[PDB]
Amino acid sequence: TLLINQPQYAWLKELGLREENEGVYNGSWGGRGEVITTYCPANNEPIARVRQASVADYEETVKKAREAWKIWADIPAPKRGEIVRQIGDALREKIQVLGSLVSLEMGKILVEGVGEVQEYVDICDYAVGLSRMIGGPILPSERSGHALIEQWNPVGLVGIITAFNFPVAVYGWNNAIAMICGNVCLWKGAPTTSLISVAVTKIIAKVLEDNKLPGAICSLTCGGADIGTAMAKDERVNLLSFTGSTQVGKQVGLMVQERFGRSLLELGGNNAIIAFEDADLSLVVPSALFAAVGTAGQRCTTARRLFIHESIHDEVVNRLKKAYAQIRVGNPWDPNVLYGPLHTKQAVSMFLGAVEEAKKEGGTVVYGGKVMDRPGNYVEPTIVTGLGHDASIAHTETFAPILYVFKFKNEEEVFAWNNEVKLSSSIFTKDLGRIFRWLGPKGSDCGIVNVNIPTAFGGEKHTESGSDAWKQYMRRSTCTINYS
Amino acid sequence: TLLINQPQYAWLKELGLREENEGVYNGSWGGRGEVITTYCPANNEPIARVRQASVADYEETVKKAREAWKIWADIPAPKRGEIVRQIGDALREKIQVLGSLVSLEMGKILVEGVGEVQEYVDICDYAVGLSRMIGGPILPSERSGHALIEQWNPVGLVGIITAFNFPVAVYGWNNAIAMICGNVCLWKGAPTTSLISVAVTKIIAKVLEDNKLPGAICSLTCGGADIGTAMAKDERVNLLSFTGSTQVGKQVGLMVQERFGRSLLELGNNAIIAFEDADLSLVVPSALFAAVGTAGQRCTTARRLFIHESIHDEVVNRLKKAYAQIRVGNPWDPNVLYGPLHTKQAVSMFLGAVEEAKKEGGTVVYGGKVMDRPGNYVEPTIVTGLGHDASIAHTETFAPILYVFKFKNEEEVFAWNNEVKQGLSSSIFTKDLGRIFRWLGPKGSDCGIVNVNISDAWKQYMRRSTCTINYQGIKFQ
Amino acid sequence: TLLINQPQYAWLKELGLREENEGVYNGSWGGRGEVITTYCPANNEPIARVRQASVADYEETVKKAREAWKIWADIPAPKRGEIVRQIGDALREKIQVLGSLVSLEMGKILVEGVGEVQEYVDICDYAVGLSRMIGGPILPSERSGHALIEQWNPVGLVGIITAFNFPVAVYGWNNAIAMICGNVCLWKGAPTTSLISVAVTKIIAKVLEDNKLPGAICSLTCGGADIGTAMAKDERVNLLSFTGSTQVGKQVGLMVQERFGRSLLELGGNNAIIAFEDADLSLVVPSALFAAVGTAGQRCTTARRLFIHESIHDEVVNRLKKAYAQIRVGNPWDPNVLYGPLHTKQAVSMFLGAVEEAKKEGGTVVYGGKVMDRPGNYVEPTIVTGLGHDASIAHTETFAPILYVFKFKNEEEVFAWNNEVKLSSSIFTKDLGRIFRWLGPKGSDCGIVNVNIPTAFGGEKHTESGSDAWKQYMRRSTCTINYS
Amino acid sequence: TLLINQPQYAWLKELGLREENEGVYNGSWGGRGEVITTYCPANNEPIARVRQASVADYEETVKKAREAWKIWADIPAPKRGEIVRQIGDALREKIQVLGSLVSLEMGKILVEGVGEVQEYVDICDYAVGLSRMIGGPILPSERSGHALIEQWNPVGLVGIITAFNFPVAVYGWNNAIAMICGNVCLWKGAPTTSLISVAVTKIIAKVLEDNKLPGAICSLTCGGADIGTAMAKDERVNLLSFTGSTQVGKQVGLMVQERFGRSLLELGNNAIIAFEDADLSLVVPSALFAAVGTAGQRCTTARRLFIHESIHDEVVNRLKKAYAQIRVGNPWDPNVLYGPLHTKQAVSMFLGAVEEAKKEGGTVVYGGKVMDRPGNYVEPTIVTGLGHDASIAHTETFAPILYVFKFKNEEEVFAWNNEVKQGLSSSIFTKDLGRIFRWLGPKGSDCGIVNVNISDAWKQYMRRSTCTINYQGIKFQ
């Protein structure tokens, strides 16, 4: 029986959810596609159902969004910012139950569910101010009576495909900035976080509707691969922002390129921690633990490879091993819990596969490697030593808590090994020259680099230069005017 | 027999050119691939020969470039700017003979050959100033004692593929900006402008060498589709800048995307729109020079002219009278305006296009024929009477054919122009301010360049990183 | 008897006001200086009393503010932005009663009282986003191993002196930006709007105190000229932002310069409207009316000089005259009212003086010129013709609704006349070349220029380039680091 | 008899200098004020003479400048940039003789005289690039159909008052930026560097004239305190840039404030701080060259050196050994490091300062005496043993006297340095990262320039305006 029909989960109704929900929103609510049940990963119990988009729903929604755009694009950017502000406030009002839904359906612990909603609120607060800054310079020409104008216009319809592990804030970032830039949006979320997508969309729909704006400015089309593929191939989707697996992302990028569209791709993270001989172990150990096992190893920023100098390799592993033992496991909505379940049963199987492959490729499981004996999708946070940095499994996209540990003897080889990889790098050392080399041209090619950083989400590290990220959701033109 | 073996073309030797030239430079000169002979399009005579890159030449050049990068990337951006400045100086010193080579091998008129080199000179001066602006903000972290640094680093090796019609300045732009950004470069130009590529590379090579820098910072691998494809597929080429045809460009972009690399693509069917209230003394000369400049072979060349029906006949008549005064001649002839098409195939394509235009109901009101003289000369051509969506008027083909269209409403002309995909520029003539705002604004043209009555580029060649660093109420120690 | 002791004005207590209020806040509330009564300008009735700062209060407050700065400056700018956000929300919660207080004590109509509070809220919303953007570039040196860093630091203590006519939002703009920039503030408001200053400070004090921050980050020292002079002369006040009369402002600027301090001065506005022969009279007439008589002619942006082409001079005057007749007069808190009283009795006397001086200098009063026969400080909105553009009275700082009208025959002379003046210019014409000349180097030297603008406060027109206004509240250093 | 009438100084004529020169330029050359003779500080011989501006000369020059501005302000910023570029070229062509004049009249060594002209050349190149960046954003209005344009306009006439110690480059900076920003300029330099002011103005005047521009765009009125005061009080001078002494600067700023004009003031007592963990191989040469460069007459000259007590004696001893090797000579002597003070009064002030330092308990550990040779030569000087707040060590006086102070704690040395008002720069030597962040951050130095172990400027010359313009659901018409 459905969790939403059970008394203690009645709070789900505060988000407008019921036993069976419409997964399409374009000003009207609907859904003639496949009905999907989403499950609570902490106990494998069905929560509720969502009627996903058919192809016809998708087609209709795109047309309605492009119609809404005609209205929305004529609304001054600061007034668009005000709408985004109101979205932030509406999320604020529901931050506790929406956070609880994130922990329930997705599986991250409560303060991260709530904190992810907070990131969306923060982004809205930011966007209101940003909306006053959207524009380019007028420069004088070398020609008398001629003006040179850098003009920024909305791209039109921004398609947004998001992943299971951040099922609120990635949409939120894309949506807040796309909106202030004068675009309409169409969202296809992970099918296993459909209730979350529906709930967020209900909050946004109310703001739009209260402001007498067409709902399709923020359209939703819940669905699986066919819907995502349709968006990738749709010339009416002027910009496709995709976040998710490397394999699907590659195919999305190719489809967009084939039609000369624009895409923004945020793909898989095989992130490294490097601890040099002179590292502060009091910093290294807790930072590595939270980076590796936080959100059950399912962040795009999750530490999956730990390089340790051979001199301190054993001590650091021994302390991580003891630390892993003390991780508090349970339901993710229990405030005491630090470690919840993996998102799906398939995830647990992928985890088991990876662990076997690591062993066969020479690795030793010095902690974990196994499924926990309890309801839900619980696996032991896992540590593997002995592999070469070259090992195929260590460079396999697996959203599971498996930490591959590598020894190194000097700066030379460990820099080289990491340069062989093509999201974030974190180093621990007191050698300033070493830090400058790693931050400079010869170092990591990662978009995110941390230096001696001890262990809310750090959205500030994922923001073009400075505040110019809005330019990614607009198109530039150079306009030359002869007013002579 | 080769022009470069004739006394009157001895000036070619001032560029270090010989009867047969090495088309590979990576610190050393070489080339073990196929020889290519390039021809002057003004008389179809062979100029000289270039030995192109083999696959092995390519592989070795990439390796040497990546080795040079270890040295180049360590040089502070302003110092790299000074190298680029010296390149501009070296170009300036050879501007007359290099310009003449551009005119001789490619076919554009001398003032434009020289002008294109001058454009590269100006780019170098621009790049020097830019080189002191490369950097990012330190932002405050929300966490006390932590700094957020926005760091910019070179991407590494920048591959540059260029086209025949601007065989100097497009490379120049990519090379100067990529250089100040701390990248090494690898150039593959159009096979039919190989001598120009060699000559430019010789000038740059001398500057590098005189500064005791490794020459592979500005590497050359002359070749055709094989070399270009290798670059597109090569994981060692961190960024591929391609300029050229949409067909080839798409395949390049796809290949780059297949390996998660970065590409810059510059691939346009430019339109001019004259509304009823237009100043025709602006419209007619603008249309003419945009249509026939460089014999219709620019990426910005005007190929479609929309005219309000009330003024359509007059503007066409005025254009015809002005076209008749176009001064045709060899690229080096004083005061000439109009030279040859780049190739014999261009001439065939031109004739094809004219035939198709008549077949689809169009009228040739001016030109349309090959000129009976040596070289690849065709009459600059005007076609009326075609429908706006007629397949021949959207065909990407570098020929001086201007297709003219009537319109009644602002609404319909905007509609017609907004169903062209990936147009490069749109130029409008009108005195209606409201109309201008409509055309420039969100519901208007989608073109990247818009004309009315006529500094962040370095980030394209670098990679950004966000770097976070750690910098009873009483602090003891 | 005091209005605050009368039943219908009990809403004043929602702002924490009582019969006698402390006018000093520095973490503690106090005031050993002169007690002042402020009056309702609509009826001359006393509202309540405020105990202003003594010199000793002032000295103590400055020391406490500089102590608070040691704490405040160590708080990350984005966290400072969050405090400013909360101030915005706290103002929001009290926007109706605070707006009503502005209409009561200051005298502008209710939607402007409320709207002025809204401007402060808007500025706070803006500042939260701005706080993430505070910083300068790191550039590479020509010298290997050397970094060039543009560093921004708070100036320290920012003294803020404001005027009667915008007794909330000018402080608010200065305070919001100064705060995110890591400064502490000290406020001295107009003595005749002391209750407003006290109320705003109570709202801010609560936010600071709830966040366990020292209250002196946002200090208040109510007082008259001696307090303002002390601030001007105080080397501990690193930046003095002054808004008010030209005469006092000049003296403030000189005192600051004498001690090599920094000042920001916003002084008197003798603003012009120019209507050319080809102007849209349907735009000109209502725009001139609201610009001239809005807030009873007491804005820094108030239109005081109207240049009309001789061809349309008479029609435009005749229509303004008819329009003035239909202005709805009454208590400014009455939602129906468009036109309230002048702020003080002295203002009414200044008004009478100006009108007499205009007559003696050759001018004709074609409408108004007189005091209205009713309780409070009501004068007739006034129109004067016949003066030369040269007339001394027409270039006299008088916050009164007097509109001096001038004829001109051509663009030449009217541009010249205006260039003789050294805040805002508004032109009405269809001649594009004319517009470009007036906007360009040869035109107005005003900081604000409007073109055919028809008639909430336009804070966007009072914002250095773009969003760089925060630099005015910080000090720049160029730091050269040798990390080689 | 005048140096310029001697054969060996005939090179002065290459600058258009004569026995007596006009010190007013406003399109025409003139000067009806007092004649001044300037002297070479290396031998106290008269060089040549300049006829300065009378009040009437000043009044007429302002009028002519404001008339020139009507023309100049209409020229597009990039075109104004090109004029500035040509000025840089013209300076470069005379760089050797103009540099020698700087050395001859002002007294800094030749490599620095030439170097200062080179600085002006470099500024001109910088300004050319800046000239294409002058502009503001169009921002969206909150009101539909309305645009917010940020407009920048020239302020009009920029007055420039400069000092003796950098008699070329300070004017150069102000002039080049003010010019590209569309302003006209009026220059009054130090009376004792009048010949330098004339020579620079002759170079600029020729560029303007050859471009058919009115010469008053770059006007000159040579004079003293009377002319400077007139500029400060003159409502027609929209912006007054003053560089010089704090005493005079304050009065200038006050006079400008009295008339609601704009001023830029550049008025410093620079400190060096060596902590216990400092690299002394960095400290000693840095301290020496910063202390004695230009015989101690830069605005950046090191006058206070704080040394941790543990290393104080060693650093002092090392400085003394290095000071003894300073190569003293005439400014034109090859390989020399140290020339004369600018004036005889500077020498008197130096002797005064040395006496006062001993009187207040200081010890002269090196130098302290006049050198017994022609000209205004004094020994570069080191004084130890004084208290940090001793009145003589904070006196603004351009002399090569380095005051040395001991300290024990970071806390006390920071305290001592933070009770100096309006210090220009602070240079620290230390390997402690935490200490650096403390010194660079909000609780650290208040100096505008901070050194560790060693593009928005155009808006200063313009005025900003915010310009708002107007650009059943169905729209009819």
Ligand SMILES: *C(=O)c1ccc(N(CC)CC)cc1
């Ligand atoms: C990785 O899991 C990841 C990447 C980016 C974000 N954002 C920025 C778009 C939302 C805060 C979240 C998570």
Ligand SMILES: *C(=O)c1ccc(N(CC)CC)cc1
């Ligand atoms: C079109 O033919 C075209 C495009 C771009 C350029 N550049 C910029 C890369 C060189 C001036 C030239 C020609």
Ligand SMILES: *C(=O)c1ccc(N(CC)CC)cc1
């Ligand atoms: C004039 O009365 C005036 C000037 C400025 C402001 N501001 C900006 C500081 C507050 C909105 C208000 C009124």
Ligand SMILES: *C(=O)c1ccc(N(CC)CC)cc1
């Ligand atoms: C100090 O003597 C000093 C200050 C400033 C300058 N400039 C910039 C105006 C010229 C390089 C020189 C010397």
